Design a binder for this molecule. Structure first.
Ligand code: CMP
Ligand code: CMP
Ligand code: CMP
Ligand code: CMP
Lengths: 197, 197, 197, 197
């Protein structure tokens, strides 16, 4: 288990540096709990570095197996066929957020869409006084900024540690075009736009 | 033979990770047979990394010797002279496909052209019910999308393990311009377009 | 303290090379004093490399703590709120200059703005006969080239070793737009433009 | 002298690979003599890697000292002042050619200009039947393609091992603009254009 050692090693570097920079213990704690969640959910492997010298059609086969969980637990990504999956599975970037961390701020102009695989997030207004929803596994958000061609309509914060998949606006728009049910999503963006005014 | 050890080492990393990600044995097997074909055809060397700090005119001399096999076994790349070779030999990127793997899908908009050095590939239709050809060493494909200014006219799958050379659309168009026999290829793209309708 | 060893190691490489290239002792001395200031002010850590695999919202939290000193000692960056900080704190690049080194030359077309955290700099004319100011901790310069849409109005040299933060023109213009007090700065650029003619 | 060992090490990798790829002994020999010239002229240091983490104004001071030889031995780069040097010294990229190697081919569209620091080169016509000149230390070539806004007017081959400095077209055009004597060069491009027809 030099992995576990390497893991605890490749964080004391950060830890030593941050101790030297005299950061607060609250922040320091957030760093540690991240690295713990990082270890327990990924076991020291780095999907990028380990799969880099793989040919594209193998990178594609691995992705459909190891990142299939997202695709099976999104209840409108069935009847979609393996062609739709094919164009999307390599453009799902896994990102990790911690509890309290902002993923989207309302007014922003991003168009990236996030698919939740683990954890739960808050959908809030600008003043953060209103909680429009709680989204979790098999759900997604950040889809409205493109369908409605509008800025981000709401703020999204993490409640827990979240395993998310980020989809770039470019891949997103290409999907809607080439794969119209792109309208059950649009029929979801609307009902959210409705319950927002 | 730390090379052979390094080789078997720089794959157990992938193997351990994929075992942990709980991939299927069929996929796992495809990974292993790739790395075996990779070892036997390349012996652990990485042409990119080993030749990187070489000056351009040496990179050019090595390429004509070690990637000459392609150029000698393509029976319309003779009478082409060493000037035509010169502008093409560094833009032939070696890629590896496995049996069953799609290289080109019909309808796609790529313009990259592939030259076969080893193995054999299938030329299929969209429904894959029709097999227009079997191409192997000294043959090439993906040339029609540019000459005809059309999308990919057919699907190309590997039958075996294939050593291919990818040529970018940019280098391809520049070649046709500056080196017209660019027409025996065009007279090949036509006869294929004919036997396709 | 292999750090201190590594540090003294990762400079003898430069030192050996420069000794071999037969550089002057004055220059050689400037190299050594830089590496000393580099060690004493940073203790061998490399903020880029150590924080690279951190998620964005953590990179953001660390930055506000460890690069907060700049933001607290700039007496017009209060009442600015944590939203203004948020969009700026990751676009402050720390750079080091040595005594005598030119940071800005008049006539140049850069728009980057520099915020001083440590040390002192000279504001000079083209002929360098005139010293318009001495700027130090909590002050900044290079702001006039954008507000006035003019080339650099003056030459800026370091008097001492300076810890500066560079802000790109792109982030700078975005700040002025979205955060108008952008006018107490403009009311500072003017009074400098006045006392310059 | 692990340097000399590292040097002989970081070439047997190339040597082993090329032996395995079954290259010709003539080519193999050209590789060895390059690496020898590389060792004797650079002693295993890599100016890029060794100076990378240096601040710009130090990279600038070192360059004027270690790459000053070029600037002092070009007899029309005096009376040029340290401002002209300043904008050029970091845009001189050192490249190495071997005897027989083409640096420029006539008809080509490059605009890069080469300054000779060591060795000698041939200026030839397309048919290579004519030798317009022999250029060596303190001389330069490739300047006519930009001044005359024409393609390369002649072929340039190395006679010996040459230490050259490459200047990009972008830096070149900027120099001519901001530093007109840009005309003693133009008065050199003309006399060459004359003695060429
Ligand atoms: N009523 C709602 N219920 C659930 N999610 C919502 C609601 N309103 C907005 N959102 C999500 O909040 C997101 C903020 O960014 P977008 O506008 O790109 O996309 C928005 C939706 O994904
Ligand atoms: N009848 C055919 N015989 C052989 N190869 C073919 C035939 N039809 C199409 N192809 C190849 O299939 C390729 C699919 O992509 P392209 O259109 O770029 O180029 C096409 C040809 O190279
Ligand atoms: N009178 C002055 N007092 C202080 N700083 C000055 C004065 N004049 C010019 N400067 C600084 O010199 C800088 C040179 O570059 P800029 O024009 O971008 O911005 C200018 C100001 O920051
Ligand atoms: N008569 C000549 N004497 C010396 N150098 C020459 C002569 N003719 C051409 N050259 C060099 O050959 C070069 C080929 O490329 P360029 O046109 O950019 O610039 C040209 C000159 O530098």
């Amino acid at each position: 288990d030099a992995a576990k050692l390497l893991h605890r090693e490749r964080m004391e570097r950060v830890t030593a540096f941050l101790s030297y920079k005299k950061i607060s213990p609250e922040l320091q704690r957030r760093i540690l709990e991240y690295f713990d969640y990082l270890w327990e959910t990924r076991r020291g492997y780095e999907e990028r570095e380990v799969l880099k010298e793989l040919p594209h059609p193998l990178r594609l086969a691995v992705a459909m197996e190891i990142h299939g969980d997202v695709i099976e637990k999104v209840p409108l990504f069935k009847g979609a066929g393996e062609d739709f999956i094919r164009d999307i599975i390599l453009h799902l970037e896994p990102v990790i957020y911690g509890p309290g961390e902002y993923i989207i701020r309302a007014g922003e102009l991003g168009s990236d869409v996030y698919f939740i695989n683990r954890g739960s997030v808050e959908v809030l207004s600008a003043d953060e006084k209103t909680r429009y929803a709680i989204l979790s596994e098999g759900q997604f958000f950040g889809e409205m900024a493109l369908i409605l061609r509008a800025p981000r309509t709401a703020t999204v914060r993490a409640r827990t540690f979240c395993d998310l998949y980020r989809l770039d606006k470019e891949t997103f728009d290409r999907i809607l075009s080439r794969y119209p049910e792109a309208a059950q999503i649009q029929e979801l963006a609307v009902r959210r736009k409705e319950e927002l005014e």
